[PDB]
Structure 1
Amino acid sequence: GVQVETISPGDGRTFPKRGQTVVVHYTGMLEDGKKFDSSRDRNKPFKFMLGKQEVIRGWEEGVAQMSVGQRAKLTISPDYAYGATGHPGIIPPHATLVFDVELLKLE
């Protein structure tokens, strides 16, 4: 599944809702901490629509349990990420993923 561990607090009250555009910054790491992607390095907030399944399951469920302004660590099992196959060239087989996510805004 996905485990969400708080890093810095949000408002404790405003959570993503189905159909909202969710705006975050993130860094993605393999289980051992090897960074593979970051919106921060691009200086480009990342947006996805909750419930559209355009991001992995661990994001759908993990970011939805964050409140606006929160920074949190999401630890995502392979079955909530890219599974047995992974995504060749960046996500290896059966990879547990760790994301450092900040929920910036809902629009």
Structure 2
Amino acid sequence: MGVQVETISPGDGRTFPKRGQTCVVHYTGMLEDGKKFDSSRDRNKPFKFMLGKQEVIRGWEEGVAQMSVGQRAKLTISPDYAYGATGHPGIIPPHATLVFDVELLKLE
């Protein structure tokens, strides 16, 4: 499948990221079984990426673009939008569906 976006808390409902803007997010990344493999919250530093530059997985590029500033959402991402058949050795297994808890803090 693609990316599914399920709201956890609403944002402003008006400000959506455009290509080339820097998204500032806090995120927690989990496997489908619930195992956490990455989290900006445990590092206490938000993660920044520029939308449209393929600095993140495809599911993030398409999922975060559907979020408004201040929204917290659950993104469910199929492997084709993720680390695919290869996965990531020792971190993400092959053909893994990933779940991300993502809060869009601001755009730069």
TM tier relative to shorter chain: over 0.9
Residue 59 of structure 1 deviates from its aligned partner by 0.1
With the length of structure 2 as denominator, give the TM-score of the two structures: 0.98
In the alignment, structure 2 segments of 5+ residues that lack a partner are none
Residue 79 of structure 1 deviates from its aligned partner by 0.1
CA distance in 2, matches of 1:15, 1:89: 34
- In percent, how many aligned pairs have the same letter? 99
Residue 90 of structure 1 deviates from its aligned partner by 0.3
In the alignment, structure 1 segments of 5+ residues that lack a partner are none
Where 1:4 maps in the other structure, the secondary structure is strand
Aligned residues between the structures: 107
Where 2:60 maps in the other structure, the secondary structure is helix
What's the CA shift string for 1:13-66, capped at 9, x where partnerless?
000010000000000000011000100000000000000011000000001100
Q: RMSD of aligned C-alpha atoms?
A: 0.4
Where 1:40 maps in the other structure, the secondary structure is helix
Where 1:100 maps in the other structure, the secondary structure is strand
Residue 100 of structure 1 deviates from its aligned partner by 0.2
Which of structure 1's runs of 4+ aligned residues deviate more than 2 A? none
